[PDB]
Design a protein. Structure first.
Lengths: 166, 495, 166, 495, 166, 495
């Protein structure tokens, strides 16, 4: 409850030595009878919370932490626990990355089943997602193709080459 | 030879007169270089590292705070200004709350409150960027001397380590007992670097895409600053309890190390404890083995006792690795080394370590060699005391043919555009020759008779004439191409 | 107060006539003085908040309203303001209404894919929404195009052009 | 005659197969029914209401909170359970809070909390759905007699108002003098009703959509539910502040009644005093006319003099009002009202009120007429002293042609498939005649001679004979169709 | 403390010389005890603010800065800060004056000239921003279109649609 | 002889039938006027001024709030009625708040409040709108006489400066020694100064668009009024807060001087103090130069010796300018000056200063010319004392052809509709001759032989005759148009 002045106003620093008890002083203004009704007042810390106890003459206090029946004043205290810590822990912030690529390398090789079938799976996925381009390629094959074998070969070539450009 | 157990063991079965072999190299993959009557080499990269990385932007992880204050004025007085809020060293906010008639200023209404505190934080990320200049590669060169501590040994003092970088072009290196090799290398093929960033936490590191840093909502520090006082997006860590008349207590988010570890998982973890193993990009390294001497081709012939200690430790390629001790005297001497068929009619093997030699008595030597496919006999020594070891390799002929040609095809694929010497006029013929070698020379030398080159080039010109004078043009194009490849590649193989 | 046996334990009802002061009462263990740091206290009414006051021996009281020196108990009190009315604050949210059922539009947009498919979707929406212009374009293509594929070509070009000029 | 100034008006002139008009009735519209040897009538609707509504779901807006309980147990001590939880009348939540060795307990860790409280609620909505059955419709019938309060008057004694409900379909209404007319219909051919629900608060009401009516996240009550014990989604009105020590300060959300006035406004407003304004949806109705005759016909025509009080007023439908005053003597009397063309020969114009009568001398009658767009003479009275009031009527005859034909076509089209009686064998002829007479009937009546039916059916059979024996088959199909329509529709018109 | 009669009611002018002290005086209306309680008061200057001070019947002083209990009266005073400066806030309103121009200039010569130039630049951008479509359309038209008018239609329409399509 | 050095050199080398020559003048773009037998001139607009501005509107940049009364009434009593509401001197508003039994009134309800205050305008922000008729165009006119102190100068005064006021269309500028030239030069046909506005503050100013100037949400006072009481756009600065009970924190925003100055930064700052230097606006200048005459033209051919002082330095457009001295005698005297081929047979170039004159002994004389690209010999004087000066200039002839033709085309396009004489009968052929000159005269005079007019018109009629009797009508149209152009512009260029 060491008292100083800042911005022309009194400024008492309270600690656990006087906790949950009526603060009392004698100042130029008069008999200062403050009630520090706050919550997180523990032993003094470095998380220095500060407060204006507002001047209240006779009215019904409410929705305040600390007040004084003499004059407005500043009060301060800490918030860390008894053992010593910053403050109460929480878990928050939303975040997640992409997921990687490694020990696979990005070129058609290795004869593997997955690598071998990836190209065909991507072709058929493109065809399913691109029916219009498939129909257009079929129509071009029909027009240009004089024989059914050439028709099918050109259709397959177009359907396989169009995605590879992307 | 160092590289045993590494799955990706690439081969170079042959050399030409120019000897300007451009080796491919990649993380976790060794390379073997052959050369007719020249020392046989093993190449690896043991460690990729980008020394002296640059710092992009630091991120905060654990927030201390102090000097938190809550000032306010009655409604119709304007939210108060503070000496606290005008400095970037703090973090702060203005808010609106319904002060009631009993609440100090007896005029109930919604008014302003300024709340804020100091914000200096303890643990922080280290964000870092790597440029193509800073890429330092560490290349290990080894001879096939067959020293004992070679199988499953990497850093053993038997070969040479060189500190290659694109900033450097030429530097000679010395292989003890086998002369000189010139590192005229060319580390050209960095995969990509604009969208990759390195992160460090005390004693661990990670690799992550740049956008991830650019979008992650946590406190910032640009790389230039050093006071740790100016911060951007500093409000995200502080989360404010709902305003309470004049109370407005500020709290932050606590230990984020756990959140980082559980969220960042799935990205490329890098074991910075042993330095930053950057598993990215291939090495395209030109080597000329013209001035690399072999010590022992002139030695006498071994004539003493012969004995085997350990049998084959079967490799991924089914390559015989015989760790064998020769109690016989006369060392140094050349070793009898034949790989013969069941009936023992003709030899068809391919020994790796040319001139297998024992440097000193009472010493094991690890001879590397690749036998044919199927069953066969390994003949070591000379009668009396002739030593025979039966062994079978499970691979199929045409199989291993197609996979080895495919390894060569991949090697030329990465060693492709801008790589193979197309600019050098006159040497363009040699470049195409070496390309046809590195693709089809397995077929040439393992399928087409082995070969005694004169008679096969005679057969090749016969095939070319028949293809040219054929009944169908498709068959002509198919066959004369093979014939000309045979002829020219044979001329190359002779060299 | 009224020291009753609620749930088989001591139970008190503190009102606003005394406030911000330690209570005193008697139990089998002896005289008990009770602290009540509840700051949001009002006079007794229907809105009765209730506690189970702990027991503390010597440790620092932290992050709690009530405590005694000997035993636990159950302290309760009202929260009505001076006018005697319940708690009071605003607001919540209600979805703004409108006329007609809107079920044709959900999900947000991928910029690249939707930009690529904007032309394909726009031609379909436009050609559907204006059958009259479909008829006129078809008639013009029928007249101008000498042979079939000219007619189809002119038709598809005009159908593609018409949305673009708008 | 209350349709002056009413934009939507149809002059339906005919009787259906069973001698029942097919009223199309829409809020803010008019119907006027005509037929020869049948006094004209005016059919209107003035009020729509729903009675005995069903309570789909009761919403209670303002929530009071009482008897709130909160308790906690330290970690590993247990999870408290209270009998208050079992009773569903309370809203309850479980939670986790840190406790500690120095924090009034035994160890550091997350101990459990249960907090819950009663949920009373005082002010409440009332949301109700209206079925087709529960509706009641206020029809009003007016006579065209020209009485002073029988023109553009919303509270005149002349009109008679009846209510229509399905539960009493076959009903009989009475019109002064003319007698008994039959009420019978099911108006359910309009828009679907299941998609709408009406909210009401004290006095105001709102029309909204069912899914929206159920989406609003507040407490519920099933329709039969009236006890207040059960409550669904009761959490939202009761906000639990952050977990804190042994406490969960329960905050009671404020009355959203202001919020509802802020949101619902903009939607479709309704006031219960005026009844529901469900103007959407056409009302088809049957209405028999067989039991009515001409009242006042026995009164003789009077040969006195006629005077005009008000000038020739114009309505929004090409129709003329004349306040004819009788200065002579001999009242009451059958009004001579006629039309002539420029040659003073033919009766071409169409009259509205057949055989108008005068109640008493010095009390003029509001005769109503519809001449064609053009020049004609309204002849009031008979010579000597006749009054051939000239009158030029703007518009194009093809104008009303297209307009009336299109309006009747759409009227029978919305009342098309599954509406007009096609199933009845034998009555298929009557239904075809009905379709023509609702659509093509104006062609028979207005443009084609007025008409005296015998002469025009003679002309029609002549036209059929000409069309059949014509030089062109296209003209034959175009003309014999019109002729048979004329003949058959004239036979129908006679009925 | 200066009383005047405006609008048939008293008007009270108060200065900061009697700041923070209850409004006490005496007039024929009675013992006019009154109080001013807001702290917005500034020194006497031209920024005159006014009030009506309501009359007590039984209620506690509430909802009004002033409070009299003998007769309703109007209190006015000064609000300027101690340095003789009017009240003011730092908030500011403006817009962006850099670039704006919708439609201007003469009527006809501008119309002709800017039409020629805007069409020239638009078509020229279409022909250089997407060149290959232009030449392929030109050769396709020259090969396919039967008449020079038809060919003109073909490649002009293709050059119009393709760059918008692409 | 004033605009040797400015980048926008332009040449007009044609005359009309009635010598009604037409020019365009822009900022920095001087013009040189050529003619046959008449003195040549240089025209420029030196300074644009906008005198007698129109005070469009005024803004009160900063605000003072005084005499701020306010009153309220209990619910159902209606709004209070003071005397300030009617008077526009006070800005004010009314609103409502909940008052009742708690705070003096009877029942809790939304009672009214009126809140008024005097708005005093401390400082002004002036707006100036320039109308077309208010542009005072300062035009400098300088002959190519032989002066010296105007080359690369601004104040150099041997000609005359005239302030053109568009109210006064015709004006006589008496050029010393040569007479006068009629000035009929309008800015009306230039760009419309309808959307340019000047913001003026104290002494500095900016230029900004009209729509932007009026869009500003600031106090809005008209030009006509002086007292400012008739005040518009009230709520820009007075920002009343939500009224609690009766008082509301009425406060005018801070001075907008800083904010609007910051916003307006980057616009076109105008140092108005030295006049309204508008940087845009065409001046369309029609002139009868027949009144003008050259007193120096007919003096005797000059005989004595003649020497050069300074040697050539190139100009921007690439014109010969020589300072030359005359040591001989016989002043005043017409000086020979020709630009011959190196063989002294046929003339290549053109001279600007028609009939240069030396009317003073021992003075520099400025001689101007414009050769083609190619070697040339400037021949000066007559033997004895012949001077020959070899000269060469870089460029491509086609370059100047395309440059001059396109420049003239743009000049005619801007000097187009409403500008070139199409309504004047008789001069129509002259007007089209002028136009065809301004487009194709570079080609006519330069490409087509220089020219000897008689023989080239003979060639012109020859090409016309071949065109009309040609094997193709397209070529006929293509060739006879050029031929008639040649003939008509040969008849013209002769003048």
């Amino acid at each position: 409850f060491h008292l100083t002045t800042r911005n022309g106003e009194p400024h008492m620093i309270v600690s656990r030595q006087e906790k949950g008890k009526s603060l009392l002083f004698k100042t130029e203004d008069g008999v200062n009878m403050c009630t520090l009704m706050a919550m997180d007042l523990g032993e003094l810390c470095e998380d220095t919370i500060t407060y204006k106890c507002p001047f209240l003459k006779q009215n019904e206090p409410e929705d305040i932490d600390c007040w004084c029946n003499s004059t407005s004043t500043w009060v301060t205290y800490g918030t860390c626990t008894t053992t010593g810590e910053h403050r109460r822990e929480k878990r928050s912030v939303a975040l997640v990355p992409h997921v990687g690529m490694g020990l696979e390398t990005r070129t058609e090789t290795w004869m593997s089943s997955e690598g071998a079938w990836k190209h065909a799976q991507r072709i058929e996925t493109w065809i399913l997602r691109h029916p219009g381009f498939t129909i257009m390629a079929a129509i071009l094959a029909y027009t240009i193709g004089t024989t059914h074998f050439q028709r099918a070969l050109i259709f397959i070539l177009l359907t396989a080459v169009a995605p590879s450009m992307t | 030879m160092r590289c045993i157990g590494i799955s990706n063991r690439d081969f170079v079965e042959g050399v030409s007169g120019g000897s300007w072999v451009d080796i491919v190299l990649e993380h976790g993959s060794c390379v073997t270089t052959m050369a007719k009557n020249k020392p046989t080499l093993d190449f690896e990269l043991i460690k990729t590292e980008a020394k002296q990385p640059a710092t992009l932007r630091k991120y905060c992880i654990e927030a201390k705070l102090t000097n938190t204050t809550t000032d306010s004025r009655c409604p119709t007085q304007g939210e108060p200004s503070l000496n606290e809020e005008q400095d970037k060293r703090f973090v702060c906010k203005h808010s609106m709350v319904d002060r009631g008639w009993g609440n100090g200023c007896g005029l109930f209404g919604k008014g302003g409150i300024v709340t804020c505190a100091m914000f200096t934080c303890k643990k922080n990320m280290k964000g870092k960027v790597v440029q193509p200049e800073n890429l330092e590669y560490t290349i290990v060169i080894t001879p096939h001397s067959g020293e004992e501590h070679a199988v499953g040994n990497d850093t053993g003092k038997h070969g040479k380590e060189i500190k290659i970088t694109p900033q450097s072009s030429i530097t000679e290196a010395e292989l003890t007992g086998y002369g000189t090799v010139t590192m005229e290398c060319s580390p050209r093929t960095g995969l990509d670097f604009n969208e990759m960033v390195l992160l460090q936490m005390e004693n661990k590191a990670w690799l992550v895409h740049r956008q991830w840093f650019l979008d992650l909502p946590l406190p910032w520090l640009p790389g230039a600053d050093t006071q740790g006082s100016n911060w951007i997006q500093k409000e995200t860590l502080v989360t404010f309890k709902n305003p309470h008349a004049k109370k407005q207590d500020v709290v932050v988010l606590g230990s984020q190390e756990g959140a980082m570890h559980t969220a960042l998982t799935g990205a490329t973890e890098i074991q910075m404890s042993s330095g930053n193993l950057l598993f990215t990009g291939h090495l395209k390294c030109r080597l000329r083995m013209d001035k690399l001497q072999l010590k022992g081709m002139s030695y006498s012939m071994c004539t003493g006792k012969f004995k085997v200690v350990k049998e084959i430790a079967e490799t991924q390629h089914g390559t015989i690795v015989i760790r064998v001790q020769y109690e016989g005297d006369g060392s140094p001497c050349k070793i009898p080394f034949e790989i013969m068929d069941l009936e023992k009619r003709h030899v068809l093997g391919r020994l790796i370590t040319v001139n297998p030699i024992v440097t000193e008595k009472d010493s094991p030597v690890n001879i590397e060699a690749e036998p044919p496919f199927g069953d066969s006999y390994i003949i070591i020594g000379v009668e009396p005391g002739q030593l025979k070891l039966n062994w079978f390799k499970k691979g199929s002929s045409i199989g291993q043919m197609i996979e080895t040609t495919m390894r060569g095809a991949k090697r030329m694929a990465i060693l492709g555009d801008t790589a193979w010497d197309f600019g050098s006029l006159g040497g363009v013929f040699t470049s195409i020759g070496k390309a046809l070698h590195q693709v089809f020379g397995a077929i040439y030398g393992a399928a087409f008779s082995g070969v005694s080159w004169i008679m096969k080039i005679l057969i090749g010109v016969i095939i070319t004439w028949i293809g040219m004078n054929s009944r169908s043009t498709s068959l002509s194009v198919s066959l004369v191409l093979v014939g000309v490849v045979t002829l020219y590649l044979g001329v190359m193989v002779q060299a």
